[PDB]
Amino acid sequence: ESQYQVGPLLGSGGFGSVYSGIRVSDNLPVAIKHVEKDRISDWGELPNGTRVPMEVVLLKKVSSGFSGVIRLLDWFERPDSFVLILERPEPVQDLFDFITERGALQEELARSFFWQVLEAVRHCHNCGVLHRDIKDENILIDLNRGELKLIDFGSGALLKDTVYTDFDGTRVYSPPEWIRYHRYHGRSAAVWSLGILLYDMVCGDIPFEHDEEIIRGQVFFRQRVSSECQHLIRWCLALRPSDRPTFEEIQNHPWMQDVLLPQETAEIHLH
Numbered sequence: 001e002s003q004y005q006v007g008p009l010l011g012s013g014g015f016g017s018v019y020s021g022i023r024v025s026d027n028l029p030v031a032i033k034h035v036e037k038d039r040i041s042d043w044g045e046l047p048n049g050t051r052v053p054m055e056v057v058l059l060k061k062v063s064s065g066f067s068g069v070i071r072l073l074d075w076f077e078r079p080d081s082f083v084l085i086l087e088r089p090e091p092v093q094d095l096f097d098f099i100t101e102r103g104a105l106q107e108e109l110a111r112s113f114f115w116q117v118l119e120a121v122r123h124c125h126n127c128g129v130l131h132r133d134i135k136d137e138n139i140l141i142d143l144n145r146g147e148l149k150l151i152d153f154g155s156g157a158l159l160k161d162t163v164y165t166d167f168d169g170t171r172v173y174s175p176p177e178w179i180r181y182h183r184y185h186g187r188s189a190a191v192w193s194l195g196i197l198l199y200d201m202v203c204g205d206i207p208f209e210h211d212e213e214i215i216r217g218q219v220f221f222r223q224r225v226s227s228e229c230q231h232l233i234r235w236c237l238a239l240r241p242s243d244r245p246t247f248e249e250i251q252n253h254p255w256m257q258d259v260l261l262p263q264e265t266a267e268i269h270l271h
């Protein structure tokens with residue numbers, strides 16, 4: 001309020017409305033995210049019983065210097081909303097916009113980005129948090145450093161080992177067991193969404209637009225993609241959840257070897 005100067009609206013949607021801002025005391029770039037109270041489905045509580053959006057609990061759980069996940073810096077409660085103060089890299093572009101501009105990504109570039117999204121998702125899971133909405137719109141690229149950041153935990157849940165029977169993330173990234181049965185386990189649903197995301201990077205758009213396509217699980221490549229990259233995508237998109245790879249198996253897959261460092265990725269591909 002007196003602590004932040006507000007700049008342009010960066011976007012709005014099912015997550016609420018996000019503005020660019022600056023922390024007045026030190027000029028730190030921030031993002032200022034507004035979530036309407038009557039739009040929040042899950043609430044948690046802090047160690048002290050303040051009731052808050054679950055999004056705030058999940059953000060505090062993943063909060064750290066590890067730069068692959070967005071950092072929550074502060075939050076405020078207002079009569080009808082919460083306001084979240086988040087990190088803002090500068091210059092930044094989300095991966096959906098990057099793919100709009102560049103089209104299908106060279107595999108070396110997809111490999112570096114996909115590897116970093118894997119390290120980020122693993123960090124979420126180590127911290128007890130299941131994101132449930134991994135997709136290009138929820139990934140920011142720090143263009144100077146070549147570092148990716150997972151954002152928007154507003155569809156997320158505490159990670160558990162039993163079945164989830166609710167879901168409010170993005171349907172075209174959701175797995176066939178959710179479409180058919182309204183049931184999924186967190187990790188294998190996450191790896192399916194990562195299959196979708198990797199196809200999106202290397203082909204320039206997602207493979208499935210319809211329920212019928214998700215449930216059939218047949219994958220057609222409309223761009224030239226190496227056999228190793230196609231094998232990994234088709235493995236992540238296995239119809240049976242226990243036939244999907246673990247994160248360890250994805251990162252040990254032959255297509256993932258020799259990944260660029262984030263700085264090298266910015267030097268070779270982003271400038």
Ligand SMILES: N[C@H]1CC[C@@H](Nc2cc(Br)cc3cc(C(=O)O)oc23)CC1
Pocket residue numbers: 010011012015018030031033070086087088089092094137138140151152153
């Ligand atoms: N897909 C778009 C990305 C740019 C903008 N959101 C956006 C920009 C910036 Br910088 C940081 C964050 C953190 C979060 C969040 O946790 O939801 O959203 C953010 C609008 C929506």
